[PDB]
Structure formats: C-alpha cells, structure tokens
Design a protein around this nucleic acid. Structure first.
Lengths: 37, 364, 133, 136, 23, 126, 192
RNA sequence: UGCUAAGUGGAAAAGGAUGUGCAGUCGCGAAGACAACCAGGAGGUUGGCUUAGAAGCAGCCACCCUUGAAAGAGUGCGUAA
C-alpha cells in the first residue's frame, strides 16, 4: 500500500472512494492500491 | 566488450590486415624489435601478395605513434584506403600475429584492451577535496574548496573551559564533507561512473562514506594514498586502480559462467554450445552473448552473404543456397556476433564449452 | 489460421517460416516444396499466403498478390520509401501506372469499381512520399 | 537564466508588494497563458525551470513567451556575520509580480496537451495561478 | 516554537480586538 | 446521433422505399463484416442491403402504406431494397441465410400488404 | 448586414459616486453613461445579468434599445470596464447613434483552417478597425488559412469584408504570420 | 430562518479529494440521452523509415482510400517479434 498526502488514479481502471473518513484508490492491479495519510 | 565500437567495422568492405604485436620502447635492445617486426610483417604481406595500398597505409600508423611507456602491446586493423583500429594493449601478445583476409580478426582485442569504463578518482582530506573524472580520451578535473577554515581544534579552550572549539570545528568539517558529497553525487548522476576511488585517511574517508547516499556508496572503493599536497601522477593512479579493475573484470566472467551453467542445467533453451546450434542461433539473430573458446583451426563455410554461416555445406544445402567460400571460425563467428549486436566474452578456461564456443540466447 | 510474407524464390529458410508454423503442429518439409512449386511464376516478387489449417495438422494455402507497398516501389524505381513523407518525395507516379496495381490487387480489394479501387492505392502512395500526378 | 546586461544602480530597495497589476493582464502573443493570483518575487531560477517543463511536455511544436523579466536585484550579505558594517552584494534577480499579471504564454495546435503543459509549469512557481485564454 | 505561536495567537480574542502588547 | 442528422437520414430512406418495388426485413446479429460483405456482393447485383435505426426508419414508414410493418422494426433491423425483380432476392437470401443460420427473416412487403416469413420464401418457387 | 436591436431597460441614477456605485453593483446593476452627439450626458443603470446576456451572444459592439423612463433610444456599446481578477463589468460607456451613421468600430478576427502539417500558425493583430453603418457592424470577420506553406503573411489588406463596410486600419498590419514548425533544437534556444 | 457531523467551535502550507448547502452558464435527451446486457469492431496493410527483431501499441514522419451501421495509420493489457 502507498501512503502519501496526495492520491491519484494512476491508471484507467483505478477508482477513488472514501472509507471511514479517508480517501482511497482501489484497483484490480495491487500496485495501484493507495490511501491518504 | 560491447558491439558498438566495432559496429562500423562491419560496414567497411575489402581486404583486412590485422596486426597484433609488441610495442615496448623501454630499453635500448627493444627499439630494434619494432622494425624487426615491421620487416617481418612487410615480408609476410609480400608473400601473401597483398596490395601495396595496405603497406603504404600501414607504415605511417606504425611509425607516427608516440611510444607507450613500459611493456604495452599494439593492435592495428586496416583496409588499405583507411585505418580503422589502432590502440595499445595491456600486455604484449606471446606471438606476433599477422593476418590478411576479408574477415577482420578481433579476438585478441576482447580481453587485451587498454580501455576501461568511466570512473571517478577523488582525493579527500577534511579541508576540501579534488576530483578527476575519466570518460576515456578526456579527463576532467575539479577542486572542491571548503567553507570552514579552522578545521584544527587547539588544546586551549578559554578561562576555565568557558568557550570551546569542539562543536565549532566539527561543524566546519561536516560542512566540507557535505560540499564534497554534493559535488560527487552530481558527478555520479551526470556521468554514471562504475567505480569511485576515494583516497584519504581513516577519519576523513569513513565519515564521507557515511554522508553519501546509497546510490553512490555502493560503488565506492577506498584507497590508502598519501597527502593531497604531494599530488599524484597518471602512472601512480593507473597502478593504484589496476588491482581493483582486475577483480572487477573477473567478476563479469564469473557471472556469465553462472548464467551459462544455470541455463544449461534447466535445459530451457536459452544456452547453446558447440558450433552445430551456435551457428544456427547466430544465423537466426537471437544470440545475446557469445563466449569464445579455443576454436583454433576449426573452419566455417559462410554462404552468399557476408553474415550467414554454417558448420558444413551438407546442412547448408537445406537452405537451397550453394556454398560461396570457406573461412576460419574464430574469424567469421565474431563478425556475425558483432553484426547482430551481441556481447563478446573471452573464456578464462573456466566455462569449458563444447567445441570451444558458447552462446547465451535471447529466447527459445 | 496464420499469415506470413515469404518471397517467391526462397523455400525452407530459417528465419521467416521455421518458427512461424513450427508451433502449430504443421509439417514444415511438405509445405515448402509445395509453396515453392506454386510460387515459381513470379520468382522475383514477395507474395504472401495464409495457412488455412485443419485439426489433423495439415496445411491448405491460397496465395496472394505481392504487397501494395512493394509493388509501388518498382513502379518508381526507388528501393525504399520516404523517411519523412510530405517533405522529401522519392519519385513520381502518374495515374496510368497505378491502374495495373488496381488490376493485380483486384482479387484482394473490397472495392467495387476501378475508379474507387484506384483511390485505395493512391492512399498508400502518400504514406510513403510518392507523388501521384 | 536571464540577467540584464547592465543596471545603473546595483543595490536597490525591496520592490513594493501592494496592489493589483496596472497593465499586462491579458494574452497578446499566444493562445493560452498563466495569470498570477497573488504577490511574490519570481527568481530567474524558477522562470528557467518553468519554461523547460513546458518545452518537454510539448516536445517539438509550439512557441513559448515570457512576459516578465528579472530586472530588480536582491542582496545577501556574507554568511555567519553580525549586523551592520555595510550592505550585502547582489545575489539573485527577481521580478515583482502582482495579481492579474500574465507570466507565460503558449500557442499549440490542440488543447489537452497545451493545457496540461501549462499546469506542469504552475507547479514550479511559488504562487497560485490559473490558465486563461483570448475569449471574453 | 509552540510557546511563541500560542502567545501571539491570543491577540484574536474578542476582548483584545486584534492587538496585544509584545505582539 | 445529432437531431439534425436523424432528420437528414429519414429523407434518403423514405425515397429508397418509394422507388423500390418491394422490401425484405431481416436481422444481422451474428454476421461478421466478411459475412456481410459476402451478401453485399451476392445480392449486390440487384439488391441493396442497408440498415439503420428502428425509430428513425419508423418515421419513414409513415410516408407509405406499410403501417402494419411496425411490428418487425423491433430488434436488430435490416432492410433490403429490391429495385429490380423479386425472384433474384427471394432465392439468394434463402441460401445465404441457410449457410450462416444467423440471418432470420422477419417478413416482407408486396401490393400494399406484408407477407409472413413462410410465404415470403415461396415466391422463389413461382 | 441587417441586425435587430436588443431591448433593455435603463433607470436614471439618483446618486453618483463610489459609495453609490458599490451599492448598485452589490444589488445587481451596472453604472452606465449615455453621451453622444446630442451633447447630453446621462447616468443610467442596467441589470447586470441582463446586460451580460446580450454581450455573450452579440459581441462587444451590440446594438441596444434603451427604455429610459418610457422612451426608446438607440445606443452603441463603446467601452467596458472589466475587473482583472473578478471578471466583472464595472462600467459601460454607451454612445447614441442614428441609422445610416458611419461609426468606426474595432471588430475581431478569427483564423480558421489547417495549413501545411509542418507549419505553425501565429496571429499578431487580434482586431482591426472597421467603418460601417450603425446597423451593419459584422460581429466577426474570418480569414482562411488552407494550403498555406512555410513563410507566408496574410496581411490585413487581404481580409474580405461585407459590402457597405470600409476599412480604417491601413493595409500594413500583419494579422497572421505562418512559419515553419519549430524543431526541438529551437525550443531550447529561446528564452535563455 | 438556515448551515455543520468534524467536538469543526477549541492552531498552520504547497497540494490531494464524487462532504454538503446556494446561485449562474453550456452540452446530450422520448428522433430513446448516461449505466448495464447482446452482436459487429473490417479490406489495401506487416503505412513508410530505423532496427538483429518493430506487424495499431521502443523511437521518427505522415495520419490516406475503400465496403459500410461503425470500425482510430489505433485507448490500454500482453509477446523476444
């Protein structure tokens, strides 16, 4: 998982969601899974 | 060796004269050997019925060179209308080698070559440093100066120890180390050297190594040289770095051996030995690295093109094309290896390849 | 069903054909002798072919006309096209010599009329820096 | 890096940072531009970094204009010294920027690449800015 | 620098009206 | 598609039925472009095999007396304009559809009255 | 060109100044001035939303028909005061006109087309000065760049104008300058 | 009369972001718009150059024509190709 102040949808299959008061990017490719922190 | 410096050698066409000999103008009973070898090669070319143009293109290349110091070899390769290869060699060959044929002979150049990759040599003391960058023909020099002047801590501190030059000198030394590290990191990012020799003392060589990032600290070899006021000459630096470069070039052969053994053991098909399928792979163009063994007097029968080769015409007739000429293996196989831009590795009697040849492929 | 471009005057070479159908279970020795015999009419022009295979690891192939890019090169005499088209133009071609490529390619074109089919070949022309008068 | 060939007075007061721009607030040469939104000093080391980010993103085509030039100098006095005893020597050159001023311009055939090429240059300046065009 | 920040920040009370002595 | 382009398309399609003696409605879901291009050459001698939107064609049907054919315009839609003769299409469609099995006729038209799928193929038997 | 004027409602300003114009703009109106050949200034107020609506679809040189206390007047938009940051309309100078009166108007030019692939199209003059009667100002004059290659200059003298429209700006202004496409070795040499 | 879900109120930047409320422009849409499911997504052709290899998909230039309901000298994944 990547934890940076800035999260962006790296590829075209990425999605930006919001869980438990946090911005997250979830993708089929596990490399693109990242969260804001 | 890469396949870039000899790439344009493929473009040239015509008879090729290749001479490897000893060029050591050291003592008084050594200059005579130079023109003795010159007469020998002249008479060999006369006996082989060489065109005059080769000889009148060679005498000036032989005679117009500033004599190299110590014991060094010499390598020449020409076509007659121009010179192509002309360098010095680390060690003189045991036998003077003269060849005159359409395919150039470059096997002795694979290992014996006074040509090392780019590298950095830095002399450091905790008042500054000086750096030399080597990229082959050109040498660049830089003098890094320091901003903390009093790098010496006197015994005196003050009245009852009030005031003390401990921290205010450590900070100066750290400033100097940071400046040197930043400059060296800039050089590493720009030129991408392979080795960064650092010569200093126990104190101002292990604290600069702890300042450098992991990028450069992995490629640092620590020296043991003297003070910076004495200064160094080119011969001394060459002798200092030769011991490290020997081991560095040995490690590449070791790694190639490991790759060859692994690919042979798995039997996947990325390794080939013996002329039978090495020639086929070289013809197919998927040869990545060529390992030259003791081919000796083995011959290869190349077809119509200057590149296509086969072990014998019996299996060459499966291509339909008929035989055109016969050439020596250690003279034509490296040519095709250069043609497809493959790397050339000279065995050190530790691979033991079948038929004295080997190849690391690119795919099935 | 695979595709491949083999020059007419070559049978059983190593690079182009060997690895190509060497993984589809198709015998390589019997195809090359048949292909060479059938293609011996051109003998100087590369002509493609499609290997229509059956599950029994047999081959049945129908030959094709030499490619349009290669055909238009000899009509101008230049061995290769423009590296930078629309700025450097290698040679000249008039509307007359285009029509023969239309006829030779008539069996491999989806066009209906010689007028429409002529524009298809003209499209390939400017893609390689060849002027059409 | 841009340096004036000569200036009369080499040590000058700090430029005032008050008010909005009185002129040069519209695109005149290109099709797209960057409009400042707050005051700052823009050094010549950030102008050169901003116009290389534009060049690399568009590669070959297009033209770049720079409407601000670093005339005014700023002086820094030697490190690790007390206060007084003269004034420092000039060290870097700046350009007084006020909100509304147009800094860079660009004329490129399409929109996406031209608009994204300007966004790369904005991330190199110490201010906030926006992309503007020639329309009303 | 927490002590300095806190001391100046309390000038923004309603009873101080944006000013305090010693900033 | 744009609103204006939809208006433009109906004008061409409306005239295509007036000048055509009859028409045949089919569906093409499952025919490759090579399969279709085969039909544009087998039937291209005398017939034209065009397709368009359902509702957009439905507007063109209001200009003629085929108001009972609106049931067949739902689903994948194909319309064939037979400018010359009827036997030419009545048998070339039958053999092509049988070969591919993915081309099922929906109906037909003649003399102001539609003819069902069973009775549209028997015209070739005349 | 035949233009239909746009009807607007204008109200006479009770007050003037900076403390009364700020109230007007905070409410939704814009101060205006209706001067002209009649030697008769008037300080008016136009609705901000309504005034900007016609400008969005009729260019800057719109033809207005102001209804000042029940009458009808024909006016022309002379100048506009626009805030650099907020992009507001802080003022509007209106000029009284009559039908058949020749007015010098600066209209805009739009370049359209696609020239040679290895060329770059640059526009120098954004607008040109044009003389026309009050009801026939073209809202835009277009120039076509097609088949134009390398060094070429579409000077202001080649721009076609509708019949009944003169040209005040001299034919020496350079409007469009089409040149060779700059290479990658030329982008680095500029601005340094 | 409305807003906030953060204990924001009761500290802070460049920047990231389908939090929510108010107002204003423009596109698309019963001629069926967006999402979803079903079927095509082609022929010249592996466009030309470079390259050992470069076939839509290291890199450079161009970016056409045809059958057509549409099909880009090709939006990604993938192969040495």
């Amino acid at each position: 998982m990547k934890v940076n102040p800035s999260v962006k949808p790296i590829c075209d299959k990425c999605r930006v969601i919001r869980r438990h008061g946090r911005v997250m990017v979830i993708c089929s490719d596990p490399r693109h899974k990242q969260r804001q922190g | 060796m890469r396949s870039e410096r000899l790439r344009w050698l493929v473009a040239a066409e015509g008879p090729f004269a290749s001479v490897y000999f000893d060029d050591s103008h050291d003592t008084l009973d050594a200059v005579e050997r130079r023109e003795a070898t010159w007469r020998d090669v002249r008479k060999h070319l006369e006996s082989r019925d060489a065109k005059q143009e080769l000889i009148d293109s060679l005498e000036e290349a032989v005679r117009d060179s500033r004599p190299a110091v110590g014991q060094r070899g010499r390598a020449l390769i020409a076509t007659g209308e121009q010179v192509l290869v002309n360098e010095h060699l680390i060690g003189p060959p045991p036998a003077t080698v003269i060849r005159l044929s359409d395919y150039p002979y470059v096997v002795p150049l694979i290992d014996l070559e006074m040509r090392r990759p780019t590298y950095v040599f830095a002399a450091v003391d905790h008042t500054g440093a000086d750096v030399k960058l080597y990229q082959g023909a050109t040498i660049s020099s830089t003098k890094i100066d320091g901003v903390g002047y009093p790098v010496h801590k006197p015994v005196t501190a003050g009245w009852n120890g009030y005031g003390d030059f401990q921290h205010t000198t450590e900070e100066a030394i750290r400033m100097n180390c940071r400046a040197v590290a930043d400059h060296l990191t800039r050089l590493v990012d720009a030129a991408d050297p392979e080795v960064v020799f650092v010569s200093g003392e126990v104190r101002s060589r292990t604290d600069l190594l702890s300042t450098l990032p992991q990028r450069v600290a992995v490629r640092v070899s620590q020296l043991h040289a003297g003070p910076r006021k004495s200064a160094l000459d080119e011969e001394e630096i060459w002798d200092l770095t030769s011991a490290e470069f020997t081991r560095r070039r040995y490690a590449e052969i070791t790694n190639v051996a490991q790759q060859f053994e692994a690919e042979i053991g798995r039997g996947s098909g990325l390794a080939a030995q013996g002329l039978a399928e090495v020639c086929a792979a070289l013809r197919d163009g998927d040869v990545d690295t060529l390992i030259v063994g003791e081919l000796g007097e083995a011959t290869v029968v190349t077809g119509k093109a200057r590149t296509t080769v086969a072990r014998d015409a019996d299996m060459l007739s499966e291509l339909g094309e008929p035989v055109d000429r016969v050439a020596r293996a250690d003279e034509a196989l490296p040519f095709a290896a250069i043609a497809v831009g493959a790397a050339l590795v000279r065995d050190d009697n530790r691979i033991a390849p079948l038929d004295g040849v080997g190849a690391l492929l690119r795919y099935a | 069903l695979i595709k491949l471009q083999i020059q007419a005057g070559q049978a059983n070479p190593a690079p182009p054909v060997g690895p190509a159908l060497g993984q589809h279970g198709v015998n390589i020795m019997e195809f090359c002798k048949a292909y060479n015999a059938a293609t011996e009419s051109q003998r100087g022009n590369v002509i493609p072919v499609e290997i229509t295979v059956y599950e029994d690891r047999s081959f049945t192939f129908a030959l094709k006309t030499p490619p349009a890019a290669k055909l238009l090169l000899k009509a101008a005499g230049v061995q290769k096209g423009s590296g930078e088209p629309h700025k450097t133009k290698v040679a000249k071609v008039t509307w007359d010599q285009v029509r023969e490529i239309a006829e030779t390619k008539k069996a491999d074109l989806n066009a209906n009329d010689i007028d429409a089919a002529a524009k298809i070949i003209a499209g390939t022309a400017r893609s390689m820096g060849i002027t059409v008068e | 890096m841009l340096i004036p060939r000569k200036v009369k007075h080499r040590k000058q007061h700090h430029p005032e940072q008050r008010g909005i721009a009185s002129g040069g607030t519209s695109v005149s040469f290109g099709d797209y531009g960057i409009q400042a939104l707050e005051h700052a000093y823009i050094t010549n080391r950030q102008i050169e970094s901003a116009r290389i980010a534009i060049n690399r993103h568009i590669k070959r085509g297009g033209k770049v204009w720079i409407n601000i030039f670093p005339d005014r100098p700023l002086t820094k006095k030697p490190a690790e010294t007390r206060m007084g005893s003269g004034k420092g020597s000039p060290e870097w050159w700046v350009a007084n920027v006020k909100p509304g001023r147009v800094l860079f311009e660009l004329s490129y055939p399409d929109e996406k690449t031209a608009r994204d090429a300007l966004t790369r240059a904005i991330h190199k300046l110490p201010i906030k800015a926006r992309i503007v065009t020639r329309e009303e | 620098a927490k002590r300095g920040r806190k001391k100046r920040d309390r000038k923004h009370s309603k009873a101080n009206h944006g000013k305090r002595p010693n900033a | 598609m744009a609103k204006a382009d939809k208006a433009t398309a109906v004008a061409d399609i409306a005239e295509q039925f007036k000048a055509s003696t009859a028409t045949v409605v089919t569906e093409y879901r499952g025919l490759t472009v090579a399969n279709l291009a085969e039909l544009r050459r087998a039937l291209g001698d005398s017939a034209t095999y065009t397709v368009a939107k359902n509702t957009l064609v439905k507007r063109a049907a209001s200009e003629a007396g085929i108001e009972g054919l609106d049931e067949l315009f739902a689903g994948p839609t194909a319309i064939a304009f037979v400018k010359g003769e009827a036997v030419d299409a009545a048998k070339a469609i039958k053999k092509f559809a049988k070969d591919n099995k993915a081309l099922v006729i929906k109906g037909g038209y003649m003399d102001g009255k539609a003819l069902s799928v069973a009775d549209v193929e028997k015209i070739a038997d005349l | 060109t035949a233009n239909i004027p746009n009807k607007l409602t204008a109200n006479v300003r009770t007050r003037t100044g900076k403390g009364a114009s700020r109230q007007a703009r905070r409410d939704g109106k814009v101060p205006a001035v209706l001067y002209g050949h009649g030697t008769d200034p008037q300080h008016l107020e136009l609705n901000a939303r309504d005034f900007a609506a016609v400008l969005r679809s009729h260019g800057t040189n719109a033809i207005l028909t102001l209804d000042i206390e029940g009458t009808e007047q024909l006016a022309l938009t002379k100048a506009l005061d626009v805030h650099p940051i907020r992009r507001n309309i802080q003022h509007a100078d209106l000029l009284v006109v009559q039908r058949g009166e020749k007015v010098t108007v600066e209209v805009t030019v739009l370049v359209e087309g696609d020239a040679t692939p290895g060329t770059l199209v640059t526009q120098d003059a954004n607008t040109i000065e044009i003389e026309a009667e009050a009801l026939s100002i073209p809202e835009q004059l277009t120039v076509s760049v097609e088949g134009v290659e390398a060094g070429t200059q579409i000077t202001a003298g080649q721009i076609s104008l509708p019949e009944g429209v003169n040209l005040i700006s001299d034919p020496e202004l350079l409007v469009v300058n089409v040149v060779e496409a700059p290479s990658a070795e030329a982008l680095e040499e500029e601005g340094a």
